[PDB]
């Protein structure tokens, strides 16, 4: 969370397994795997996600996030904030068989 | 005045007091079979003072004792059948029937001119304590009676005048005294602050918290 | 700092007020009547978030009817007959330092509540109806099919100031912001049907109204998180010869 130093609130970062459908309500989301990320006492939530495979519709996990309390601010503070997101390859990955990129064309 | 210490505030000798709970009359001869005997479901929610004391606890476990004071007015000695029907027993619906002759109903026979009749009912219930308050329903469809369970039920005392072939035209008056013994209490609860409106409900009308004074700074 | 509690969901928070100094515990700690402890029930079933507005009076949730539609716990109530459970309730609100207010988080065991009209009956949908925060109201209630709901007598006729007997924790916004009440199982029968009987009722009562100054958020979100601990049920299989 990159925002004001006076804002507080809660979020429900929810994870759906590969086969599972994305939840359609906050209530549905809460039944699954969920982390209640407190913006007041933390400002970084790290989620190691397993079962990441090539899959060459498709079975894929889903990460959703839901309001739980909303953003609460005291007087003289902006009415907007933002959340940035990062991604990595964790402890180890394994890659097999070279192929050319389908990006930059010859 | 001096300090010292106490031991008059223990639960046992707080709630354990003999107090009148029921008074009724009956006439042996009349045109109403209802009035030829006395019925009395045992409960402690009729005397307002006694009720308020016991309701400062949620669960109570005690074995009571019941003493009867019977007087009679208009020649020879007169005897009284003081029967106790326990929960799920047969109850008489009229004077003289097989329910009086039931041998599973503990029945005192006391004749006048002797020290008062007494017996000590034990702790009946299949629960592990009577519960003053119940926050539930009688069925799981939740359409039944509210705030009533059958595990706090106590029997009935039926009093009749043992008579010959043709009774006298006497009339008697009974008074019942009730006293817990070996009381134990679990979970305390705030005192009542409203006047009772029903003998079984917890119904009330809102009332102010406390009496008012002229000003916050004013104290005399 | 932040003692991250994990069960199967995570709740980050940072005193415990035990109900009467008794922690939830199995009945086995004490054939004909076998029991089946379900150990997968516990996890944080976070309820809906009520808004503490300036003009509000108070709120109550009947247990265990609040968790009647919540996952596995909800399912077991339908399947099984007799069951007993204890609860760890975390009531947390989030507010700044320009907000002033006071709350009384109190767990009241067996609260029978009288009708709005004396000598009338009301339906079960007037006390509980899934997960809803029923609202106490100022003055009297004249709706016949409602509960009395007068805040000053707490809807029981006992006086609201005296509710401090029951295991309670005060959330004064000035200092702390969290209340943890660990309620054990209290009943006069070892285990009971979980539809008929509402074991206890959680009440949150604002004793000082919220004043938020000017151009600040006009509500303080109060979230209730309930984890059923040490839940036991009845066996569903036959005994040996």
UniProtKB/Swiss-Prot annotation, chain A:
Coiled coil residues, start to end: none
Domain of life: Viruses
Cell compartments where the protein resides: Virion; Host cytoplasm
TM spans (from-to): none
Function: Forms an icosahedral capsid of pseudo T=3 symmetry with capsid proteins VP2 and VP3. The capsid is 300 Angstroms in diameter, composed of 60 copies of each capsid protein and enclosing the viral positive strand RNA genome.
Subunit relationships: Interacts with capsid protein VP0 and capsid protein VP1 to form heterotrimeric protomers. Five protomers subsequently associate to form pentamers which serve as building blocks for the capsid. Interacts with capsid protein VP4 in the mature capsid. Interacts with protein 2C; this interaction may be important for virion morphogenesis.
Stated name of the protein: Capsid protein VP3
Portion of the full-length sequence here: 450 to 563 of 2201
Curated annotation (Swiss-Prot), chain C:
Annotated localization: Virion; Host cytoplasm
Lineage: superkingdom: Viruses
Description of how the protein assembles with itself and partners: Interacts with capsid protein VP1 and capsid protein VP3 in the mature capsid.
Functional summary from the UniProt entry: Forms an icosahedral capsid of pseudo T=3 symmetry with capsid proteins VP2 and VP3. The capsid is 300 Angstroms in diameter, composed of 60 copies of each capsid protein and enclosing the viral positive strand RNA genome.
Name listed for the protein in its UniProt record: Capsid protein VP2
Full-sequence portion shown in this chain: 83 to 329 of 2201
């Amino acid at each position: 969370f990159c925002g004001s130093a006076m804002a507080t609130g809660k979020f429900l970062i929810a994870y759906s397994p590969p086969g599972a459908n994305p939840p359609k309500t906050r209530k549905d989301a809460m039944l699954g795997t969920h982390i209640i990320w407190d913006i007041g006492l933390q400002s970084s939530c790290v989620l190691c996600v397993p079962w990441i495979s090539q899959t060459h519709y498709t079975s894929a996990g889903y990460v959703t996030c839901w309001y739980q309390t909303g953003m609460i601010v005291p007087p003289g503070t902006p009415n907007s904030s933002s959340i940035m997101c990062f991604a990595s390859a964790c402890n180890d990955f394994s890659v097999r068989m070279l192929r050319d990129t389908p990006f930059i064309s010859q | 005045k001096n300090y010292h210490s106490r031991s008059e505030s223990t639960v046992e000798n707080f709630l354990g007091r003999s107090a009148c709970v029921y008074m009724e009359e009956y006439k042996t001869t009349d045109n109403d079979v209802n009035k030829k005997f006395v019925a009395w479901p045992i409960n402690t929610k009729q005397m307002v003072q006694m009720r308020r004391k016991l309701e400062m606890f949620t669960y109570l476990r005690f074995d009571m004792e019941v003493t009867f004071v019977i007087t009679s007015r208009q020649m020879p000695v007169l005897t009284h059948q003081i029967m106790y029907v326990p929960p799920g027993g047969p109850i008489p619906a009229k004077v003289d029937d097989y329910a009086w002759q039931t041998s599973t109903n503990p029945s005192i026979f006391w004749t006048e001119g002797n020290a008062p009749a007494r017996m000590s009912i034990p702790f009946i219930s299949i629960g592990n304590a009577y519960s003053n308050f119940y926050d539930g329903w009688s069925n799981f469809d939740q359409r039944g009676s509210y705030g009533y369970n059958t595990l706090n039920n106590l029997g009935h005392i039926y009093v009749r005048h043992v008579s010959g072939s043709s009774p006298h035209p006497i009339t008697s008056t009974i008074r019942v005294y009730f006293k817990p013994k070996h009381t134990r209490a679990w979970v305390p609860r705030p005192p009542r602050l409203c006047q009772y409106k029903k003998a079984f409900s917890v119904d009330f009308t809102p009332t102010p918290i406390t009496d008012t004074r002229k000003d916050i700074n004013t104290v005399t | 700092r932040s003692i991250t509690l994990g069960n199967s969901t995570i709740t980050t928070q940072e005193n415990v007020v035990v109900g009467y100094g008794r922690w939830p515990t199995y009945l086995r700690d004490d054939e004909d009547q076998p029991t089946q402890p379900d150990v997968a029930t516990c996890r944080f079933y976070t309820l809906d978030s009520i808004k503490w507005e300036k003009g509000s009076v108070g709120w109550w949730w009947k247990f265990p009817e609040a968790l009647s539609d919540m996952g596995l716990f909800g399912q077991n109530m339908q399947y099984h007959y007799l069951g007993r459970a204890g609860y760890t309730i975390h009531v947390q609100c989030n507010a700044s330092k320009f907000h002033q207010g006071c709350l009384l988080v109190v767990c009241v065991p067996e609260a029978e509540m009288g009708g709005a009209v004396v000598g009338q009956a009301f339906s079960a949908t007037a006390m509980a109806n899934g997960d809803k925060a029923y609202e106490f109201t100022s003055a009297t209630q004249s709706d016949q099919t409602k509960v009395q709901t007068a805040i000053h007598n707490a809807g029981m006729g006992v006086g609201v100031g005296n509710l401090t007997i029951y295991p309670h924790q005060w959330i004064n916004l000035r200092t702390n912001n969290s209340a943890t009440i660990v309620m054990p199982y209290i009943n006069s029968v070892p285990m009971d049907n979980m539809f008929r009987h509402y074991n206890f009722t959680l009440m949150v009562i604002p004793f000082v109204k919220l004043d938020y100054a000017d151009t600040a958020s006009t509500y303080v979100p109060i979230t209730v998180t309930v984890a059923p601990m040490c839940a036991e049920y009845n066996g569903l299989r036959l005994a040996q010869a």
